[PDB]
Design a protein around this ligand. Structure first.
Ligand SMILES: [Mg+2]
Ligand SMILES: [Mg+2]
Lengths: 514, 507, 110
DNA sequence: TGTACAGTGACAAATTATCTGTCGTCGG
DNA sequence: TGTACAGTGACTAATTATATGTCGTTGT
């Protein structure tokens, strides 16, 4: 084991004592000790015994023997031990759970106990503040602790299962999460809508952003599936994005690492994982998600805080003009956000490295050039209805719609896996199991509405209105209920319901991409 | 103007110059003074001309003439004006409206313009911070500015009319506004309800709290009417409040001063004010009404922060256990809050004075002891229906309910002023205009409901349900649309039940 | 830093008994001829007190001198400066500033 | 003149470990 | 070992108003 003490900058009295010690450092003759000790007593204006004591402190200890020594009672209160423990316990107990008691309130409890004990001289307010001083101080360091982070090139990710998985190359481990964007948006007229949701997908080996989905829709496994589709497929943008670089990323993960939200623990994402072959993993804590969490802070600082309609990070920062100053449509925010991610964010230097651009680290990081996946083969993203049973005459029933198709009647009594798109359920793909291998059977079409379209949400909402009204349900009556609601909304003086208008602007951006 | 300057912290070099000047205070002779200069040139390691300059700097400035003055460039920037104006206005434009541009982002705009102009030395980010530094300190100072306060016995309350009310004595100007308390309360079963609303009525002259209302209920001209009657009437509290002094505070204001909430700028408070004879006055800014507002910080600091279920003053300071650690019901919180106001707060020192309690100053500050008003005469709190007309058959129809009155058939076709209680609309007081004055006529009653009590929000909720149910309008039909929804829960009804249990304990 | 870590010359140093001092300030002493190991001292009223040793982590085994670590650090700074806030990284800043500015729709009436 | 409670600089008093004299004791 | 950007001490280079000599000029 080891120990040492070193003097800090000497005080002026300690400097003088240093000159006296140097005056007493040379001699070898008892006569010269006597001479220089007596002149040192005169120089310090002290007794000869005092100079002897000073030399002995510098002999048995360092320069810290000729600096002053602090008192033994420094940091001990002179009030009784009962009172110091009473003040300490009263403060701590006053803060259990939701309660928040101030030192002044503690002082009132001290005075109340003093009346019970008939103590004419209890600790006053300043003494209570001093007694609680270190208790309040420690707290202020514990809240502020910095984490070292990782040093680079070697990285692993801690899962909620307690397992640590390494990250070895680009597209080894993707991560994803959603946020509100801190910007208010307007419709194509200039009336306010909502703050949109931004979903990002990001590669853990390179920190390069793989894809995004920006829209008014609340988070869902459908939103995660749209974001995976954009991440995975090769990307191209028209001149209206004004890009100078290309996003240039594509291909599919080996693992997908997420929060514990229902969106990522949904059966829909699990079916996407099994078809594309990328097992999912839940993060242990939000602090393990640093690679996906931090980019939202970076976007707030570099991008969103400069745009009209900025709402601040939270209500306490909200500019009073945030609703007076909203101007961007969703299509215009996406033009800005994609220019930023392609020309700026993915072109910045990768932290934990300093040598490499984030994209260059993705591209050089690849084990091999990934083979592009044809867009039609992201049909895997369709939801599966785990079974339906082929009824007599080849019918299937799904969400109250009745479907028939080109071969189904030969399979009556079997169970088939319907695979469907929630954006348009008027046609469904039917798959069956043969030799424990799922195979394609046919496309099934909702009888009598093959020329229409219906999202699953329209069919579900119209079905509730039919059940509430007490009317029967069939393909024609369900279709009539849907087109009648859109006609009734068209009679409204605003033609607005929040979702109908947010969907109109979102769909207008979605179908302007081509 | 006068123009003086004084030196401080002189010594560090200057004591050597000071000792030189002390050696030179007198032109003793042309022969000897030159020798004193040539001697001082040993203490300062410098020529005769440096010592002659030192003596001239001393004689023309005094002690600051010993100290080295700061350079003329101090606080000026060498980057040139173009860049100094570009950097200053870029920051300012980028923090316009909702934008909050950082100096780093300003530096990026500097590099962008320098690239356009083919400059080679666009100011460095460290110098951008320095150039923007002065206009950041100003912003921080302009937020931090303290205001003094009324000092002594003289006080002039500013209104939105630019008129000031001179507050001369107790009950001259009361004040009121509302706020949330910062504690989550529970029902009598221990499940979460919501954070109550607290109303306070204060007298401006004494700063004594003259009345309160605490409840889950919403700010409304009803909650203001209830705060008014609790303030005006003599106060009684039982032993379960454990009070050791009395809230001996009552009587009628001459003026009532408020924020612009719809509770206060309302016909209902106008009619209360005209019948009680007090004038309604509007607060010009939140910062004029500190006598109402500041009771609320003191209560957070002295009372509510020390109670379980405390929620903080805002969402960034919310204790994460607040939703799990709630324990008090509305009846406990009132039994604590009333004690706090009677034993502590009204008994503490009036801060403007230092030598009176808030209650002592109120009681001594009355121009005379006011007579207690009869509890029946607080029927001026009853809401007014201004212009309903008597139908043939001696009838009045009102919020779907139909009413019959003892002389009312004499006045079919005439117009009547109806006074009613939102807590109990089974009965209506009917007044009519005669000789251009109101005269009382009769106590009309909802026919077939004389044994029954309906509050206005129940008749309203029953009417909404009845309209949407497609059933007919009648006194029972409305009662039928109450008694099921009664018997069969929704937070507002659960809140109302706990609020009712407190009102029961008031009886 | 947590777990008893210190940063010096861009290397990360781990202290042997240091972990209880996270969030505290310490001072430190080393021989410029070899900065693979650093001596950590606590600060007190007139004295530094020797606290523990600390060793460099993630580096090569060969003993690291101080001048050599400065050199490694200027090679990183030189490499970073080759990506000289390079023009792509700024060209965006005008167009971000000019999709805004152009959209003055906050209060436009007829 | 918005406002009033809790936290914070500035100063004074009682207590105690620490530095100084003076003398006595022991060693060279 | 969460994660990566904006603000910040600590040090250095370029520019300048300023302190120091040296001599010429004038007043005493
Ligand atoms: Mg999340
Ligand atoms: Mg208000």
């Amino acid at each position: 084991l080891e120990k040492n003490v070193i003097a800090t900058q000497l005080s002026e009295e300690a400097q003088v004592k240093l000159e006296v010690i140097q005056s007493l450092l040379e001699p070898c003759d008892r006569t010269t000790y006597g001479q220089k000790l007596r002149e040192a007593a005169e120089k310090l204006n002290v007794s000869l015994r005092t100079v002897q004591r000073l030399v002995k402190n510098w002999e048995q200890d360092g320069l810290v023997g000729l600096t002053q020594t602090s008192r033994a009672d420094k940091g001990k209160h002179r009030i009784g031990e009962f009172w110091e423990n009473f003040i300490t316990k009263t403060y701590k107990e006053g803060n259990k759970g939701s309660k928040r008691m101030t030192p002044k309130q503690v002082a009132l409890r001290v005075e109340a106990k003093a009346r019970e004990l008939k103590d004419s001289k209890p600790p006053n307010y300043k003494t209570v503040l001093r007694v609680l001083a270190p208790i309040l101080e420690k707290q202020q360091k514990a809240k502020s602790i910095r984490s070292p982070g990782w040093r680079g090139t070697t990285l692993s990710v801690k899962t909620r299962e307690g397992k640590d998985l390494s990250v070895d190359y680009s597209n080894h481990v993707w991560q994803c999460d959603h946020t509100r964007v801190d910007v208010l948006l307007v419709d194509q007229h200039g009336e306010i809508l909502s703050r949109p949701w931004l979903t990002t997908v990001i590669d853990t080996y390179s920190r390069c952003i793989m894809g995004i989905n920006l829209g008014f829709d609340a988070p869902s496994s459908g939103v995660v599936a749209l974001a995976l589709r954009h991440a995975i497929l090769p990307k191209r943008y028209g001149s209206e994005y004004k890009l100078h670089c290309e996003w240039g990323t594509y291909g599919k993960p080996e693992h997908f690492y997420t929060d514990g939200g229902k969106d990522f623990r949904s059966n829909h994402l699990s079916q996407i994982g099994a078809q594309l072959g990328f097992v999912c993993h839940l993060r242990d804590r939000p602090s393990e998600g640093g690679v996906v969490e931090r980019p939202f802070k970076t976007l707030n600082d570099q991008l969103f805080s400069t745009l009209p309609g900025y709402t601040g990070s939270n209500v306490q920062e909200r500019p009073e003009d945030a609703e007076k100053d909203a101007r961007l449509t969703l299509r215009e925010l996406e033009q800005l956000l994609v220019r930023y991610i392609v020309d700026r964010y993915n072109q910045s230097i990768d932290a934990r490295m300093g040598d490499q651009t984030r994209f260059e680290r993705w591209e050089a990081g690849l084990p091999t050039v990934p083979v592009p996946i044809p867009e039609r083969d992201l049909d895997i993203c369709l939801m599966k209805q785990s079974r339906r049973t082929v009824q007599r005459g080849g019918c299937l029933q799904f969400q109250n719609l009745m479907y028939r198709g080109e071969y189904l009647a030969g399979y009556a009594g079997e169970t088939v896996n319907l695979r469907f798109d929630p954006r348009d359920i008027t046609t469904i793909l039917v798959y069956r199991q043969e030799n424990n291998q799922e195979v394609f059977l046919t496309r099934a079409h909702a009888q009598g509405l093959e020329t229409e379209q219906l999202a699953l949400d329209e069919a579900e909402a119209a079905s509730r209105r039919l059940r509430t009204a007490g009317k029967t349900i069939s393909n024609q009556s369900l279709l009539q209920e849907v087109v009648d609601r859109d006609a009734l909304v068209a009679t409204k003086k605003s033609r607005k319901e929040r979702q109908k208008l947010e969907q109109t602007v979102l769909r207008s951006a979605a179908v302007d991409e081509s």
